[PDB]
Design a protein around this ligand. Structure first.
Ligand SMILES: O=C1[C@@H]2C[C@@H]3C[C@H]1C[C@@](O)(C3)C2
Ligand SMILES: [Cl-]
Length: 145
């Protein structure tokens, strides 16, 4: 299996699925390094974020658990296609990159927060992460290049 993937069993349905413990991605099909990657993200901050402030909210007060619930809901909408990642990033990301549809540009290893970097470089081109935790908050990461 590709880097960081394991087999798991669905608790509701009993069907086998696959889980990546670096990106927190999960998918039903069996899963299919560069100097740099290009990613977008959607950040949901919380009261324990290193800077609990954003363009959306001068004082961010939501709990870490409430932030995770928001992230999980956004992931549901992106995967069902009801909403686009770029649309939700522009509207709801607590990062200044919201105004760029969440795009962060290209980057190398040794520039970004470690959990963010590890998830970014473990994603395949076009693939989206599950919830990724850093000192800034909780992220959904989309690798675009
Ligand atoms: O929320 C974030 C902060 C700003 C940039 C995007 C993401 C990860 C990072 O390391 C770089 C810290
Ligand atoms: Cl790839």
């Amino acid at each position: 299996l590709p880097p960081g993937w394991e087999k798991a069993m669905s608790r509701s349905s009993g069907r086998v699925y696959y889980f990546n413990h670096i990106t927190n991605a999960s998918q039903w099909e069996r899963p299919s390094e560069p100097a740099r990657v290009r990613c977008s993200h959607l950040l949901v901050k919380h009261s324990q974020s290193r800077r609990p402030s954003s363009w959306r909210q001068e004082k961010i007060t939501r709990t870490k658990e409430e932030a995770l619930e928001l992230i999980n809901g956004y992931i549901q909408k992106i995967k069902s296609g009801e909403e686009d990642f770029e649309s939700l990033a522009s509207q709801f990301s607590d990062c200044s990159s919201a105004k760029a549809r969440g795009d962060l540009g290209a980057f190398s290893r040794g520039q970004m927060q470690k959990p963010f970097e590890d998830a970014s470089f473990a994603l395949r081109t076009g693939e989206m992460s599950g919830p990724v935790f850093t000192d800034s908050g909780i992220h959904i990461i989309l690798r675009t290049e």
